[model samples]
Target: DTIKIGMTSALTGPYNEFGEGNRRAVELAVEQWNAKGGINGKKIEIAMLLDDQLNPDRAVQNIRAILDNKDIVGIIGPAGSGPMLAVIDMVQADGRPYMNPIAQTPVVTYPGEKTGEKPRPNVFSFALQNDIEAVAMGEYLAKKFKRVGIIHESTAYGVTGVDYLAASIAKNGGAKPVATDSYNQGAQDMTAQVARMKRANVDAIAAIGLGKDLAVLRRTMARLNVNVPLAASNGALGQPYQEGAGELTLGTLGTMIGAFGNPMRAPAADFAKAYKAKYGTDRWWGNDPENPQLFMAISVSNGYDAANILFEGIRLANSTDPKAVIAAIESIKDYQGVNTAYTFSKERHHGIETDGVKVFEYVKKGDKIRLEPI
Candidate 1:
C-alpha cells in the first residue's frame, strides 16, 4: 500500500528553483522515512509530479490531471500564487483535501472564513500569507520612519504584496505611502522609480519584489545618493536581497520568520548545524527564497507532519482513505511542529503564527551578510 499525494510544482520555468528544491527535499524526507520503515508499514509516494510552468493555465491543466486520479488523497503544492489561483476553485469544488504549503496571497484562501471553518472548507495553507509581511513591515516602519515610500515590480505578486503592506501600514495609523511606485521585474533602469520616490521626499522606503528586483532598486537608490532608511518585505530579504544589494544591505532590516539560526532556539539551531554539515555551507543568500531550504522546509515538514495527522484519521477509519485522513487533520488540535503550529478546525487553517516573526538586521560583522537579532 502507498500513501499517495499530489504535487503541482514548477519543475521548469524561471521559478522552477523553488519547485525543484521542494521536490528534492520531499524526496529526501521520503527516503529517510522509508529507511526508518514506511508509514504504518506502507510506502508513501508522491502520486504525480506535474510541471506548472509556473503558469496558471498550465498548472491548472496539471491539477486536472491529478484530480482525475481518485487515489491521490491530498495535494501539497502549486508553490506560489499563479498556480494556486488557477486551481483554488477546482480544488475546493472537489472537496477531498489540499495542503497548500506555499502560496501566500491572503485572498487565495477559502472564499470566506465561517466561524470554526474555512470558507471553501477543504483547503488549507501553511506559509504566512503575503499580507502578513506587509503588516510586519508597516509596524516596524511606523516606529522607525514617519514617512515612507514603496517600490515594487508591477507584476501580480509584487502588486499584491504592496497592497497588503499598504493596508498594514494604514492599520498602524501610518499614512498612505508618500511615494508608491512600481518597476519592471528585469528592467535595467531604476532611476525613474527612485527619482519619483525622491521627488516625494520620503524619509523611508520599502520594497516588495524579488530580491533581484529589490537589488536593482537599491543600487539605483544608492547611485542617487538616497540614504533614506530602506526596509524590505519578506521578498526583499533572503539571498538575492543580500547579494544584489551587497554592502548596501548593511544596516538594512529583513522582516523574516523563523530563527536567525539562534543556537538557543533548539531545533532551529540544530537545523542550522545539520544543514551546514550536509550542504558544506549555510543556506546563504545565494539560494533563492522561492526555492531554498526555507521554502522547502514548509512542504517537507508539512508532508512529514501531515502523515502524522493522516495516520490518526486512518486509524479512526481503519482504512487508508482520504476522507478519514481529512477528518483526522480537521480534528488536530494544538498540534505542534518545528515547521508551524497547526490549529486546523473544519474552517480555520490559517497556520500558527501570524504575529510572531524574526526581525533580522544585516550588519557587516567582518564583511559577511550577518543577520543579527533586531
Candidate 2:
C-alpha cells in the first residue's frame, strides 16, 4: 500500500543548512504526491531519514541499514562528497537506484583515476557537479584576471573542484593560478593562506570551499588588505557566507544553477510559491517572502526535483522494483524540474551539463544581499 524511499544527509552538522533544506523540499514533494493519490495509488513513505553528520563512516552505516530494508526501493544520498563516496560502492553493489542530490564531486558518478569512463550504473546525480561549475568559473576568471590564486578546503570536493577549475582555465587560455593553498574544513583562521596569496600578488582569487570557510577566507582577506576580486564555487552563494561576512560579502562572485536567473523559470517559480505557502518564508527563503534565495536552488530545488523525478520513474514503470525504476528513469527526456530540464540516459547519469551552470555576483540592494547573474 506504500512505496518507500530511504535518505541520508548531514542533518545535524555544520552542513545542516543544505541537509535541512533538502529534507524540507523532499517532504513537500511527498506531501504533494500523496495529496494527488500518490505514485500509482500507493502512498509514498520515507522509510528512513538518517543523519550522517557529514561523517563518511556514519554514512556507510546508514546506507547499510537502509539497504537492509527490503521495501525501500530507492535512496537519496548524503550531503557531502566524502560521505557520498563512502556509500556509493555499497549502493552500486546492491544495484539500487540512488539519487544523489547534494554531493558535487565528479567521482560520485564518474569513478576512478581517469575521465570519460562509464558512470556508476546505479548512482544518478541531481547536484550541480563541480566539473561543470569549474568550467564556468575558470573561464570567467581566466578571461577577466591576469593572475588568479586558488584557496580551497582540503577535502575531496575542494581538491577535485580546483583541479577541474585549473584545467578549464588552461584550456580556455594559457592562464594559470599564481599560487594554490588549502585549509582545514571548519577552521576559523586562514591568515597564513591569505597572506601567501597576498604575497604572490594575485589579481584575483578562486575559492573552492563551503560557506563558513569561505566567510573565514573573506574576513582574513579583508584583515590582510588583499583587495583582489574573489570568485568561488556555489558555496559562496550560501547564507552562511553572507551572514558571516556581512557587508564584506558584497562583490563576491560564484557559479550556480541557471534556475536562479531573473524571470524565474516556470518550474522554479511554481516551486517557490508552493514552498513559501507551506514553509512560510523561513530563513532559507531569504529576505523577501515573494522571492526565495538563489542558493536554495542548490539543495531545496535539487532535492524536490530528484524526488519528483524518482516518483515519475516509479509511476512510469508502475513497479517498485529497483531495476525497473532505474530503466524507466533513464528513458526520461526533457522532463522539466525546478533546477533544470533533466535528461538522463544509460550512459549519462548526471542531468545538468555545463550549459546549466551560470556565474553570479553578490551585491547589496539596500540592506538585503542578492545574487545577480553575471
Candidate 3:
C-alpha cells in the first residue's frame, strides 16, 4: 500500500520564496522517508502539489480539487495566512489530517473561536504564528525598553500582529507605545512614519510589515540618519530583508521558531545538516554567501517536522485512514523534533508550545552577519 498526501503553496507571486522553500523541504522529507522503506510496508508519496498563490479563492479551489482524489491522506501547506484561513474550512469539512507548515495567523487554527464555535479539529499547524512571535517580542521589550513606538502595515497580518503585540506588551508590564503609525503595503516612502516616531522621542521602535517593506524602512532610516534601535515582527526575517536591508540588520532583533545545525539534536540536526549540505547553512540570514539572508528556515524546519509527525502518526496508527492518523497525532506527547517538541490535544491544534520560540540577534562579523542568540 502507498500513503498519498496533498500540498498547496504560493509557488508564484511576491511570496514565492515561502512556497519554493516549502516544496523543497517537503520533497526532502518524502525522499528521506521513502529511503527508510517508509511506514508499515507502505511508501509515502505526495499525490498532489498545487499552487494557491496565497489567494483565498484559489486556495479553496486547490483544496476541493486535491481532496477529490480521496487517496491523499494528509496535506503539508498553503504557505500564506489568507490562503490558510480559507484552506482550513475546506480541510476541516473533508476531515483529513492537515499539517500546516507555513501561514502564521492564529485564526487559521482557531477560526471557530471567532464565530462562537469550538476549536477546529483535524487541522493542526507547525507554522510559527504571529501571536507566538508577538508574545516573544513583547516579553523581550518589556524587560529591556521603555517608550517604544509601533509602525505597522495596514494588512491583515500587520494589523493582527501589531494588535497582538500591544496586548502582550501590556500584559507583560511594558509601557504602552508612545506613537502608533500605519503604512500601506506598497507605499514607497516611510519618511513621514519614521519621522513621527523620531519626533515622539521613542527610544525603541517595533514594526509589523512584510520583509520587502521593512527593508525599505531600514534603508529609509539609514538615509534619514534616525538611528534608534528596532525590534521587528516575524515578517522582517526572510530573504528579501536579508538581501535588501544589508548592514541595517546589525543589532536588530527578531523571532524564529528554530535554528538548525548549531546545537545539533538527532533528527533535527540530521535535517539541518542535510539542508545545509544540499543548500548551504541552517541560519536564515547568513547562509547565502552572496545575498547574506537568502536562506529560508521555516520551510525546512516546520515542513520537515510536520511531515515527520504525520509519518509517525501513520506508522503508529497502522492504517492509511485520515481519522486514525489524527487520533494517533493527538495522542503524541512530548514527541521531540529537530527544533521543538510537539504535543497535540482535542482542545489545541497547534502542537508547538511557547517554549518553542527563540529570539535572535543579527550579529555582524567582518562584512557578513548571522542571526545568533542575544
Candidate 4:
C-alpha cells in the first residue's frame, strides 16, 4: 500500500519563502521515512502538491483537487494566514486531517473566533500562533519601548495580528500604538505609512506582515532614515525579508520558534546536522542570494515536526482513516519533535505551548547576518 499525502502552499506566490522551506522539510521527512522501509510496509508519497498562489479561489481549487484524490490520507500546509483561513472551512466540512506548518494566525487553529461555532475537533496546527508571539512581543516591547507604532497589511493575517498585539500590549500595561497604519497587499511603497508612524514619535514600531511586506517597511524606513527599532511578528522571519532587507536587517528583533542557528535539543539537533550534511552549511538562504540554500531552519523545522506528528498518528493508529489518525494525534502528550514538544488535547489544538516561543535579534557576523535568540 502506498500512503498518500497532499499539500497546498504558496510555492509560486509572493509568500514562496514560507512554502519553499516547508517543501524542503516535507521532502526530507519523506526521504527519511522511505529510507527506513516506509511507514509500516506502505511507502509514503505526496500524491498532490499544488500552489495556491496565496489566493482563496486557487486554494479552494487545490483543496478540491486534493479531496478528489481518495488516496491522500492527510494534508500538510497552506502557508499564509489568509490562505489558510480561506480553505479551513472547506477542509473542516470535508472532514480531513489538516496540519498547519507556516501560517501563524491563531484563529486558523482556534476555529470559532469569528463564527461563534464550536472549535473544530479534528483541526490542528504546528505553526507559531500570532497571538502567542504577540503576547511575548508585547511583554518584551513594553520593557524596551514605552510607546510603539504598528504597520500591517490589510488582510486577515495582518488585521488579526495587530488586533492581538494591541490587546497583548494593553494587557501588559504597555501603552497602545500611537499610530496604527494599514497597507494593501503587494503595496511596496510605504513612504506615507512610515511617515505616519514616524510622526507618532514612537519609541519602536511593531510590524505585522509577511516577508515581502516586512522588506518594504525596512526599505521605507531606511529611505526616510526612520531609525526607530522594529519588533516584528514571526512572519518577518523569512528568506524574502533577509534577502530584500539585506544589510538593513541588523539589530531587528522578532519572535520565532527557538530552533534557529543551533537546535537546543534532540531530534532537533539530529535534524540540524542531517539537514546541514545534506543541504550544506548556511541553510538559511544566507550563503548566496542568487542561489539560496535549500533549507530554512525555522520553517523546515515546523514542516519536519508536522510531518513527524502526522506520520506518528498514522503509525500509531495503524490505519489511514481520518478519525483514527486524529485520535492518535490528540492522544499525543509531551511528544518531542524537531522544533517543540507537542501536547494535543480537546481544548487546545495548537500543539506547542506559548512557552516554546522565543525572541531573536538579527546580528551580523562577517557579512552574514543570523537570528540569534536574545
**Candidate No. with top lDDT:** 2
lDDT to native, each model: 0.65, 0.85, 0.75, 0.78
Residue pairs with backbone overlap in model 3 = 268-338
Q: Regarding TM-score, does 3 or 4 come out ahead?
A: 4
Model 4 Cα lDDT, one tens digit per residue, 265-311: 76766776677666664535456533322225455778888887889
lDDT of 1 by residue, 193-226 (tens): 8988888898888887656677788898899988
Ranking by TM-score: 2, 4, 3, 1
Candidate that scores best on TM-score: 2
Order the candidate numbers by lDDT, best to worst: 2, 4, 3, 1
Worst 10 residues of 2 by lDDT: 112-121
Q: Candidate 4 — what's its lDDT?
A: 0.78
1 or 4, which is superior by lDDT?
A: 4
Give the Cα-based TM-score of candidate 2 against the true structure.
Answer: 0.96
Runs in model 1 deviating more than 4 A are 113-117, 154-156, 183-189, 263-320
Please write out the lDDT profile of model 2 over residues 1-374, one tens digit for every residue: 79899999878777778888899989999999999999989999998999987788999999999999998988988888888988888899998889999788888888854333578877778977888788788789878989999998887888889899999999889478999988878988789999999999999888998888899999999999997788988865677888788888777998888775677889888998899999988977878766687888886888898899999999998898888988898889999988888888876777777777788887778877667878
Pick by TM-score: 2 or 3, better one? 2
Q: Lowest lDDT 10-mer window, candidate 1?
A: 284-293
Candidate 3 error regions (>4 Å): 112-118, 182-186, 280-296
Clashes of each: 4, 0, 1, 0
Q: Which stretches of candidate 2 lie over 4 Å from their true place?
A: 112-117
